[PDB]
Amino acid sequence: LTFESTSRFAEVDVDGPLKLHYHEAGVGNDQTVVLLHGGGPGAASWTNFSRNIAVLARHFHVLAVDQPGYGHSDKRAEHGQFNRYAAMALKGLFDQLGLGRVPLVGNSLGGGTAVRFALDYPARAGRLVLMGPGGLSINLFAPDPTEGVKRLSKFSVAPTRENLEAFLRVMVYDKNLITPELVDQRFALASTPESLTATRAMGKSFAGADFEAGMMWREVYRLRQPVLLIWGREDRVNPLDGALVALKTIPRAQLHVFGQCGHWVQVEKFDEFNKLTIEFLGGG
Amino acid sequence: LTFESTSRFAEVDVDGPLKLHYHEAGVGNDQTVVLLHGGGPGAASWTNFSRNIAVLARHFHVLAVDQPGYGHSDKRAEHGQFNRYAAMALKGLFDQLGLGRVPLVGNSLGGGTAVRFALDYPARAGRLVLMGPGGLSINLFAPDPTEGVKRLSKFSVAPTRENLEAFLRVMVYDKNLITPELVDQRFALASTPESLTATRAMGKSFAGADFEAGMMWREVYRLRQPVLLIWGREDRVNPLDGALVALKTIPRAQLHVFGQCGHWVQVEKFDEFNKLTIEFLGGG
Amino acid sequence: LTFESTSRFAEVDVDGPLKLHYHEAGVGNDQTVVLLHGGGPGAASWTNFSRNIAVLARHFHVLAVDQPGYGHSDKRAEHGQFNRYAAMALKGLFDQLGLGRVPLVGNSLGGGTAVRFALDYPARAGRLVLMGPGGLSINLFAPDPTEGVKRLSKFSVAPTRENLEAFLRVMVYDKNLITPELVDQRFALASTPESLTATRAMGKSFAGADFEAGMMWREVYRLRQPVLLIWGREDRVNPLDGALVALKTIPRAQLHVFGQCGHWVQVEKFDEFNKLTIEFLGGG
Amino acid sequence: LTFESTSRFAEVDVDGPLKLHYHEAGVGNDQTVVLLHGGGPGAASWTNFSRNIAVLARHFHVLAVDQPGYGHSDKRAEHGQFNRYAAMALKGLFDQLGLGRVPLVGNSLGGGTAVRFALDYPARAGRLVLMGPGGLSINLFAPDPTEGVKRLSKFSVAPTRENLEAFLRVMVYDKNLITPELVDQRFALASTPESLTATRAMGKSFAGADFEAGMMWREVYRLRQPVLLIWGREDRVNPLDGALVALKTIPRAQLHVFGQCGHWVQVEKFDEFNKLTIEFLGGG
Asked: Name one Pfam family in it (chains A, B, C, D).
C-alpha cells in the first residue's frame, strides 16, 4: 500500500468539471469509510492518514479524499464557503462511485466538510468520527483567533519556511514530530503557484455572503447518527472548549479526550485513534 | 459465575479486624483487576458489576470488593473519611492476597476510594478507570448539593420506598431501568438495622476533621499513571463539569463521554464500557 | 408608589386583539426603559421588580409590562412560541406609544422575551440587561430538564400549594425569602382558572413547529448593542453554564456573577442589581 | 498627583533586609487599600494604576506597592516562590505601619501576591479585587503555557525591543494602547541589568520545591472575605477559563467579565473598573 498503488482520480461536477484525487485500499471489504483530511499548508490525504490507512484497510473499504484545494485536486481560484464547496464535490464522487450511506472520518477542516456533508445530504452519511474539527467547534473561552489560526494567517500572508515551522510547532504536543524533512516537504508542496492560488481563494471565500454555512455549531442538533468527537487536550488550533456545544446538542454524541496530544490526533495517538475508530465503526 | 460461586471473604485490620466481602473470577488469568462499586443505598459489588464481571473475567483476574459499609462487609458504626477508610482496608486485602501493583476500576464512591488508594500507596495502583467519580470531581457550574446528592440525603433522613425510588430515578438516563424489582431489592438491603448503622456512620464521618482527604481534585496532579475518566453526559449526581479539574491536572488522563447516559455508566452503556476498559487495561 | 398609581393598560393586535397591562413611573425622566418579568406561576411585573421599580424611576422612564399570560394581561388558551408571541405584543405596544430604540431589562422568561424582541425588532432595542435569561441560554453541562424546570413542570401537572412552594424554594439561595405569605400570594394568583389555562397553553407551545425561535443561543451573535448578563452562581433553574455561548458570541457583552444568589437576582441582590443596572444604562 | 509626591520607601526584613518602594495618597481618607501591580517586564505600581490611583484616592487611603523585583524595590538575584516572597515583604510593611485588616487590589502577579498574602496572613486581609489573577487561576481549557506566557518567556531569553512589543500587544484588546512611547518606556526600564536579574531570578524560582505555594486554586476555598474577580473576555495571558475554580470555591466570590477587554483591565476599562472597585470596597 503506497502513495501510488492507492492513487485514483475522478471527475465530478461542481459548477463545472472538478477533479478529485484520492486513495483506495481494502478493496475486498464490505464497509466503506471516507477519510477527510485536515487543512494546513501542503496537507493531503496521504500525509494525513498514513499511520491510519493500512490499519483501517484491514476492516474497511477506505477512501481518503484530497479535498478540492489540496493534494492533487483542483485548485480552482474561486469558491464559496469551503465546507459546502467540498461536500458538493464529495456528493458528486459518492454518486459516481455509487456509495450509499457511508461513515465519515475527518479531522479539523475535514471534520467540517464531514459535518457539512452530513447536514446537507442526511441520507448519505452514517457514523461520524470528528477530530478537533472546525465548523461545529466554537471556543467558548479561547479568544479568537487562536494561536494556530494566527500562525496559519501569518503564513498565508508571508509564506516563509520560518513561518511554516512556527505553524507546525503548534500542531502538536510533541514538537519533536516537526522535523526538517517534514517542514521541507510541506513547504515545497505549499509554495507552488497552484497552492498559493488555492490559498488566495480560501482567503476570499471568507468574505462570502454564505459564511453562515460554516457555523455548524448552530446546526448539529439536527444530526441523528452517532458521532464520535475526538480531541487532543493540548489542541492549540481548535481547543477543547470548542467541543462543548457539539457534545451538548448532538443526541448521540460521544467525546474522547487524549491528554498529551495536540491537533494531530491521528498522528500523535495513532494507535488508540485507530482502535477507537474501528470499534466505533463496528469493526467491519 | 454466580453471586455464590464467586463469593469470598477475608479479614483485614483497620484499627481492628475488618471483614471484607468480595467476588473473584477468571482465576487462571495473568492480570488482576480490582473493581470498586458506587455507593447508593443497598449497593454492592455484584449488583454494580454484573453486566461487567463475566466479560472482564475472560481477560483479567477480577476482584470486585464490597467496600466497608456495603454488601456483606463490616458495617462498623464509626469511621473516618470514607475513601481513606476504604483504601486502608483495600491495602490490607492486597497485602494479604499478595497483590502488587494493580489496576483499579471504580465508579462514583468507588472511584474516590480508587483515587484515594492511588494517592496513598502509589506503588500499588496501576491504571485507573473512573466512572463519574466522587472525590476528584468538583462541579464548577452545578450548585452543590446536586439533585442526586439531595435525593440521597432525603432518603438518609427518611428511608421510605418512595424516597428510594426518587433517588434511583436520577441515577439513569433511561428511567425504565428503575423497575419494581430493583427498587424492592435495594430497599430491603438498605432498610436493615445494619445498613442504617452504616448510613449513620457515613453521615457522621462528614464532620470529621479529616474532610480534606475527600478533596482529591487538589491532589490528582500527583498521579503518574494513565487514567481513564468516564462520564455519562446526563449524570445528575456527579455532573460532567466536575471532570474538568481532573482532566486538566492529571498528566496522562483521558476522558470519554457518553451521550444518553446517566450516573450508572457500567449498566447503561455496559457494552461500550466493557470494551473500553478491556482495551485501556491492555487486553490482558 | 403603588400598583394602581402606576397601573395602566393597552390593546394591541396579535392575531386579533390583545390586552397588555403595564406599570408606568418616572414619566418626568428622559430615557425610557422597558422591564420584562420572570415566568413563574402567578408572576407579574410589579411583584417581580417591586424592589427595583422605585429606584429605577428616580433615573428613567419605567415601563414594566405584564407579558401575555401573566398578571392582568390576556391569558389566552393557545399561542405559538412564547417569546416571539410576547415580542409581537410588545412591538405593538411600541408603535402605539411612539417608542424609539429602547433599552430592555428582563429576567428568565422576560430575558428570553427581550432578546427575541431585540432580534425581531432590531431598530427598536438598545442596551439589554438580562438576569439568568431563557432562550439565549443553553446549559452546556447541566442535564435538561434542570431541577428547577422540573418543579415547575411538576406544578403544572399538579398545581398544589406544596408543589408551588417546592418551586419557589429552588428559586432562591436564601430560602427565608420564601415566606408563607409569599406562597399564599402566588398560589392565590396561580390557581385561578385563567392562570392555569395560560400555564397549560404555554406548556404545549413547546411542541410547536416554531420551537427554533426559542433557541436564541443560535442567534445572539447578531446583536449589536451592549448586553449585560447577570447570573446567580447558585441558579438551579437556568444554571451558570447557560451563560457561556452568549458571553462568547455577543460582541459587546459583559457578565456579572453573584455568589450566594439564585434565580431571582433583582430580589436577592436588589441593591447591587439596581446600582449595576443604573450605571450600565447611563445614569439616565 | 505624581510619582515623587506620592513616592515613599521602607525597609523590612525578608531573610535579610529588603527595600520596598511604594506610593501614598488619600492620607486624609478613612479606609486603607493596598494595590499590587502586574508582573510584566518593566512594570511598576505607578504606571500600572496610573488611571486608577487618583480616582481611588478621593475615597480611600491608597498604598500602591512595588513588588520585590519591580520598580524601585529591591531586585534580588534569587528568591523562592515569588508570591509568597512578595507576601512576606508586604506583611513586613504591614506591621511596620500598624496596618490592620485591609482590602487588597491586584492584577496578574499582583493578584497572585494578594491571594497568597490573604492566605498566609488571614487576619490581615479583607475584601479582595483581583483582575485576571495568577496563582489562583488554573486554565481548564487553555493549553499551558498560554500564548501570552510564551511571549514573556521569549523576552526573558531574548530581551529585545521587538520581543517586548510582541508581549505588550498580546496584553490588550485594543492594540492602539501599545504606543511606541509605551514600548520605549517599558523597554528602557526592563533592559537595565538589575531588571534582567530579577527577570532571571524569577524565571528560575519556578523550579523551586515550594512550587505548590503558587497553586492557589487549591486553597482559596479557605478564604472568608468577599472577593471580586474581574477578567477580560479576550485575555490571552490568563484566559477566562482560569476564573472557574475560584468562582466556584470562594464562598463570597463575584465575577465580572468585560468583552473587548484583554489582560489589563485597570487600563482598558479604567472607568468601569474604578467605579466597580469603589463600590465593592464600600464607597469609603
From this structure: Abhydrolase_1
Query: If you compute the radius of gyration of chain B from its CA atoms, what whole number of angstroms results?
Result: 17
Q: Are D264 and A172 in contact (CB under 8 A)?
A: no
Contact indicator for B35, B62 with CB cutoff of 8 Å: yes
Residue A282 is labelled as binding a ligand? no
What 3 state SS string does chain C have? CCHHHHEEEEEECCCCCEEEEEEEECCCCCCEEEEECCCCCCCCHHHHCCCCHHHHHCCCEEEEECCCCCCCCCCCCCCCCHHHHHHHHHHHHHHHCCCCCEEEEEECHHHHHHHHHHHHCCCCEEEEEEECCCCCCCCCCCCCCCHHHHHHHHHHHCCCHHHHHHHHHCCCCCHHHCCHHHHHHHHHHHCCHHHHHHHHHHCCCCCCCCHHHHCHHHCHHHCCCCEEEEEECCCCCCCHHHHHHHHHHCCCEEEEEECCCCCCHHHHCHHHHHHHHHHHHCCC
**Nearest CB to B248; choose among D138, D215, D249:** D138
Q: Domains of chain D (ranges plus CATH)?
A: 1-284 (3.40.50.1820)
Closest-CA distance, A236 to chain D, in angstroms, reads 7
Q: Where are the alpha helices (DSSP H) in A223-269?
A: 244-249, 265-268
Chain D contact probe: residue of B215, B217, B248 with most D CBs at under 10 A: B248
Binding region of C: 39-40, 48, 107, 109, 186, 264
Instruction: Report which of A155, A139, A164, A129 is spatially closest to residue A250, judged by C-alpha positions.
Output: A129
What's the rounded Cα separation, in Å, for the pair B269 and B263? 11
Q: Which of B140, B247, B249 is the closest to D248 by Cβ?
A: B140
Which chains does chain C touch, 3 or more C-beta pairs < 8 A?
Answer: A, B, D
| A39 assigned ligand-binding residue | yes
CA-to-CA separations, C134 to C141, C149, C217, in angstroms, rounded: 16, 11, 10
Please report residues of B whose CB lies closer than 8 A to that of C142. Answer: 141-142, 239
B91: amino acid identity, one letter: K
Give phi and psi for D177, each to the nearest 5: -75, -20
Measured between alpha carbons, how far is D137 from D149 in angstroms, rounded to an integer?
14
Nearest Cβ partner for C252 among D250, D251, D260: D260
Give the method used: X-ray
Q: Which residue has the cell 420564601?
A: C178
B40 is in an annotated binding site: yes
Cβ within 8 Å, pair C241-B141: yes
Against chain D, the chains showing at least 3 CB pairs within 8 Å are: A, B, C
Resolution in A: 2.3
**Between chains, do A147 and D142 touch, taking CB under 8 Å as contact?**
no
Q: Do B233 and C147 touch (CB under 8 A)?
A: no
Residue B100 amino acid letter = G
Q: How many CA atoms lie within 13 A of A104 on its CB side?
A: 36
Give the integer Cα–Cα distance in Å for B106 and B137: 13
CA distance D8 to chain A (A): 40
Is C23 in the active site? Answer: no
